[PDB]
Symmetry: D2
Subunit: 199 residues, 4 copies
Amino acid sequence: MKHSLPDLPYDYGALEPHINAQIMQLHHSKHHAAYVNNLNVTEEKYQEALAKGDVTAQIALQPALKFNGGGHINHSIFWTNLSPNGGGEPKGELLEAIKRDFGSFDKFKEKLTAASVGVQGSGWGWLGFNKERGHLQIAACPNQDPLQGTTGLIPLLGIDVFEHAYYLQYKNVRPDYLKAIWNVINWENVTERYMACKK
Amino acid sequence: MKHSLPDLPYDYGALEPHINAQIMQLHHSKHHAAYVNNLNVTEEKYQEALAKGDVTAQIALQPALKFNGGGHINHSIFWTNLSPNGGGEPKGELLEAIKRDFGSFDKFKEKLTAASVGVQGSGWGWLGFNKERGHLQIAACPNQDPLQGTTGLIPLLGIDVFEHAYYLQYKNVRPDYLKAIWNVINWENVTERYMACKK
Amino acid sequence: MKHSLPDLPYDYGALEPHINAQIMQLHHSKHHAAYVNNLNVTEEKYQEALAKGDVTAQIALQPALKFNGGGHINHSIFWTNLSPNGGGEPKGELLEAIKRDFGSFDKFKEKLTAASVGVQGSGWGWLGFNKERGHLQIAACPNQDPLQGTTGLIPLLGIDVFEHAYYLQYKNVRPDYLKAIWNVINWENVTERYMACKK
Amino acid sequence: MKHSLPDLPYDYGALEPHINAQIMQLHHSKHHAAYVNNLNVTEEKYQEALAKGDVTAQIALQPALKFNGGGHINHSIFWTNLSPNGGGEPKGELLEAIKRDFGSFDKFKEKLTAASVGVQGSGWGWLGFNKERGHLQIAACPNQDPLQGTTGLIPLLGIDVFEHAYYLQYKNVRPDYLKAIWNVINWENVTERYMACKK
Ligand SMILES: [Mn+2]
Ligand SMILES: [Mn+2]
Ligand SMILES: [Mn+2]
Ligand SMILES: [Mn+2]
């Protein structure tokens, strides 16, 4: 059982003019493809170390497993969080939960925008669901550290603030990239993930 | 006494075709200018906290002080480490030290290249001088963490592997950026820093 | 500003038999005294570095500032959170808040106990108040990293799980130390800190 | 692979009066036993996660794997580095190497002592061999982070500065524990590890 690079659920230029085709093609066919391959390489090395009981090799492989493994997790969710049919505001119970936990939808965007723009270096901004507390929660993750594996929160919406995700189009003005991405957020997908957390 | 953005010792397009003018202009006039301003803002906030004895505010300001403060340190050295008159190999005692500590100049480039390309996320690759041991030493730093402040090593040559330092020209192929930058390394400046470490 | 070691609100043997007198004496007159002394020395160096604009020295002093500065913050709160007249359960809105956010007082004890016992190495277990969300929140901190300075949460009740806090009496059985400390929790002080969080 | 708690090469009271019998008994039968048991449980979970491709579970298990896995590595080496027939100074090439890399045996003790006493919180002080550079090197590790797995250096002599390693006897005065441990250093074992580093 090996991990595979999931196909993009839309054309490279489907999110224009918010995210140009050059960024989408590089972000998926180059960056994500490398994470999957490196992930499969690390898993095979880790399996050999675990069979031999080489705990030293297991720990030496952790940085490569979390970075590439997290990259495969984060980017796989990122594509579904975007869509040419996205934008606007969510509906149903998710919208009610955003108003209840953050006050309003605009306030929520402000909190997630501040968490995303506040990331110093490479990282991610996430809207997650706290299963224990039963409400929403915003958190930032450094580098490719996945949300659930490092915080326990269930990812609902992630914003890649790696420079490779916007620099070609927005250069150093990360806020401009954060303002535009809200227009293509696939709230239908984010709603499916939210409803799955409640039973 | 406030920190200031040092002027670039050459034209934006002096390092072409290795580093295009668009990268140099953005890297200096936008990224570095922000580090200096944010650094001065943080120092003033830290001074107020220190006068009031507010240790909580001091610690809350550490991430902003190390990132912007380190950025001002790293980029100020980075410009002098490059030059249109650079490239080739160093001479004198520095070349002898590289051969003695790393075997050869090509081996040194291999070690610093591996440290630079091995940085997962944002960071820096550095050639430093270990004053205690009296020899050279290669080390990688995450994000803008400066070399001397976090390792004690005296910086001699730094390679910015932040994506903003090469993505516009080399995209995700960081190795291509590392291969080209060796042609514009200002070994005259790196020699001055090395000779200053010995007395 | 010259920080000072606060006088203990009680004699070293007031919390027996839950925390013996030898631990209290060492924890206050040796461990806490060292943080204050080292903190004052570090603050003086930070003042000298700021006057000279030595950013390298500032970053090099951060670990000592956070450890000793956080130690002064944490232990100063720890003494007030304990009392010979403590124990039992809180009353009023704090008890209602514990029931609301954690289900019941017993469930809250189980969650904070797991967080304190879960600390690998040295650290602290904290019950804090999230002013932005307006409810309670449990969090663990590594080493002496203070709660508010590193997380923003306002400390209400802290449990020192440094080995020096229980080893002399409970040895490696940290769970026994967690069970015994509930008998001396000064809920009057925790309520004061909880009321200070509200308008 | 089912890791096992290694038998001690001596009785618990063989290293008296430098390390009393109560510490040795607790450190081996309680502290080290917990790392092995928790390590075996964590490895089993890692095998289950790998078979299912659950990368989230793999990353969530890393802290427990590094702490307990590193604990098994460090303590297993620590017992062999000590002996009732130890003490004094090394001989042969190891002594020459200590003189070459650190000037003298006394200066080496001062450097490794400062590194061990300098650990803030829990950690380890290590004398290691850098195979790439072919000389000795001193390094400190936080918590149970093993030397080779996190730094690449081959461990030669380790000093446990976890509070549980000395507090019962020396209380908060860690320097006294560092001075006393030199009397039981098994330089015969350290030489074997140093000779294994060379062809
Ligand atoms: Mn990305
Ligand atoms: Mn840069
Ligand atoms: Mn303490
Ligand atoms: Mn130990």
